[PDB]
Amino acid sequence: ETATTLTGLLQSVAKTFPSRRGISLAGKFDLTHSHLNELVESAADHLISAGIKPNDVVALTFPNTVEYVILFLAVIRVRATAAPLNAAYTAEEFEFYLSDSESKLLLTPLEGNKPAQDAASKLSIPLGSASLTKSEEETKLTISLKHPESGSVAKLINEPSDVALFLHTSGTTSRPKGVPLTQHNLVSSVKNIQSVYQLTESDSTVIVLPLFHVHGLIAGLLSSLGSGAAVVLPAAGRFSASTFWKDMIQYNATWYTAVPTIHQIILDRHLNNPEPAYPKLRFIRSCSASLAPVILGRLEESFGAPVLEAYAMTEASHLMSSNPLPQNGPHKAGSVGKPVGQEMAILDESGRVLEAGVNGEVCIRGENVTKGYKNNEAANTAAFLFGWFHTGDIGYFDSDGYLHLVGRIKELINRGGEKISPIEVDAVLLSHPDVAQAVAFGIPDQKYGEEIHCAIIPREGSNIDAEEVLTFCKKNLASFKVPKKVFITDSLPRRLVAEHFVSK
Ligand SMILES: Nc1ncnc2c1ncn2[C@@H]1O[C@H](COP(=O)(O)O)[C@@H](O)[C@H]1O
Numbered sequence: 001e002t003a004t005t006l007t008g009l010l011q012s013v014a015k016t017f018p019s020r021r022g023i024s025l026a027g028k029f030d031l032t033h034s035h036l037n038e039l040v041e042s043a044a045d046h047l048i049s050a051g052i053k054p055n056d057v058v059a060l061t062f063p064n065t066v067e068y069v070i071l072f073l074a075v076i077r078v079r080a081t082a083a084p085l086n087a088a089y090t091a092e093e094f095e096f097y098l099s100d101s102e103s104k105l106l107l108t109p110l111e112g113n114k115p116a117q118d119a120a121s122k123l124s125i126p127l128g129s130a131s132l133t134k135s136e137e138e139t140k141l142t143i144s145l146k147h148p149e150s151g152s153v154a155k156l157i158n159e160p161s162d163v164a165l166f167l168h169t170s171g172t173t174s175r176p177k178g179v180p181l182t183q184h185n186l187v188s189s190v191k192n193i194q195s196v197y198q199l200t201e202s203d204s205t206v207i208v209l210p211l212f213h214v215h216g217l218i219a220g221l222l223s224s225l226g227s228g229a230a231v232v233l234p235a236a237g238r239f240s241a242s243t244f245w246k247d248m249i250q251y252n253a254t255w256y257t258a259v260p261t262i263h264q265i266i267l268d269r270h271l272n273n274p275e276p277a278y279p280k281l282r283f284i285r286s287c288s289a290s291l292a293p294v295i296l297g298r299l300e301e302s303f304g305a306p307v308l309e310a311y312a313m314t315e316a317s318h319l320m321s322s323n324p325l326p327q328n329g330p331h332k333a334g335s336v337g338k339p340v341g342q343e344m345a346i347l348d349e350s351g352r353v354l355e356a357g358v359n360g361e362v363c364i365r366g367e368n369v370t371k372g373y374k375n376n377e378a379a380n381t382a383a384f385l386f387g388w389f390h391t392g393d394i395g396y397f398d399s400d401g402y403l404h405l406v407g408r409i410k411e412l413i414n415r416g417g418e419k420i421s422p423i424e425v426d427a428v429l430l431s432h433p434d435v436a437q438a439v440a441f442g443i444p445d446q447k448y449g450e451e452i453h454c455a456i457i458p459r460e461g462s463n464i465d466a467e468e469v470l471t472f473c474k475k476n477l478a479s480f481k482v483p484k485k486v487f488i489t490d491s492l493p494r495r496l497v498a499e500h501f502v503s504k
Contacts, residue, residue, distance in 0.1 A: 063237030342366025351386030
């Protein structure tokens with residue numbers, strides 16, 4: 001009996017392990033698989049009542065809270081599409097993402113999200129909030145609509161083809177591409193992640209990544225719940241260095257997944273403030289940005305768990321390749337391991353499958369890969385050349401078929417796992433009336449791996465400064481995307497600009 005649907009897999013988990021711990025708010029309360037399912041079903045009923053019909057996009061801007069986990073599964077449950085969005089976005093960003101995703105409802109915490117609410121208000125998109133009260137008197141997920149539609153979920157059968165998760169990604173055009181991930185895509189990816197790491201109901205983990213990115217959402221939350229394993233959300237609604245190990249120990253965690261920058265903080269936290277003992281984990285996971293072999297070495301030596309580096313992207317519904325469990329094979333530093341439940345080939349510009357050791361574009365094919373970018377035949381033409389999905393990454397296979405990432409064909413600045421389009425930031429800078437030309441570029445950074453700076457040629461006669469350019473960018477871009485330095489110059493000739501203004 002194999003699930004055709006993520007909703008169906010999670011319902012299968014509710015039935016099989018109804019009493020087992022599903023999700024917890026660290027040091028506050030625990031929800032069983034069956035209780036979470038009842039809450040998801042109740043929230044689903046409320047989304048129907050609110051007028052959410054199949055294929056409708058419901059935008060979600062929350063921290064990593066149980067409210068978000070219920071709503072997300074409830075949106076998917078009623079055959080609607082979850083469009084999670086970074087709460088840290090500007091009104092200008094929120095306006096585009098809500099607009100381009102055709103969001104017909106925005107949900108925030110009770111405190112709200114003013115930039116997101118400003119965007120929805122202007123786009124005439126209905127607003128609501130969600131709050132979970134779990135006291136001795138009641139347990140209730142209150143969905144409060146500002147514009148209520150009304151004053152059930154039996155007839156609704158989820159289909160594999162149903163778009164469940166919608167996320168934006170960057171490529172060539174300054175307008176982010178829309179990535180529709182099906183009910184079929186996510187359950188395919190959960191099986192891959194469950195398989196390679198052999199996740200079981202006895203596993204538990206602490207979420208230290210944002211649940212609006214596929215890493216935290218699919219590998220962290222959904223792959224755990226689909227496996228019947230337990231998920232623990234830190235009280236802070238985000239990664240907390242001080243509570244991390246207290247929460248891992250108290251909730252008997254067997255594994256965690258983070259990015260190198262998070263691992264770095266946890267390592268430094270082990271030097272200054274060592275725990276008396278550390279819980280023996282099955283494995284520690286790294287993804288999203290290249291893990292330095294030194295870090296991998298330190299993590300393993302410090303915590304005594306095998307560190308397994310993986311390679312994931314949104315279009316692939318997260319996981320593409322991973323180093324295996326030590327029991328199943330070796331893990332190699334500076335490698336992202338072998339493909340998992342999908343075909344992977346190294347292709348030259350002509351679509352020739354290159355032999356081992358030769359650098360080409362890493363291309364994938366599998367049930368976890370998006371049908372294609374939403375209403376964007378141009379992007380899909382290039383992205384699906386020769387019947388493979390083109391990642392935009394340059395890499396090679398060694399004799400054992402282990403992938404090594406050595407470069408990028410696409411223009412990205414990977415800032416500690418967060419993706420910054422130089423093309424999107426160029427569009428913002430060029431839009432400034434006193435800016436004539438602008439080039440946002442990437443440089444090496446000890447902490448974040450890469451960092452964004454920019455170089456500007458101002459409109460002849462204007463007296464613009466870095467402070468003006470920064471202030472303006474901060475109104476239009478999220479702080480992580482904003483260039484940290486602005487080199488105002490006379491002429492531009494990008495790799496060449498980065499080669500010029502880089503420091504020694
Ligand atoms: N282990 C890794 N090392 C280096 N880059 C990575 C790694 N995993 C993922 N990436 C990059 O992250 C991209 C996916 O971005 P996203 O869709 O935001 O997850 C990939 O195409 C790579 O460029």
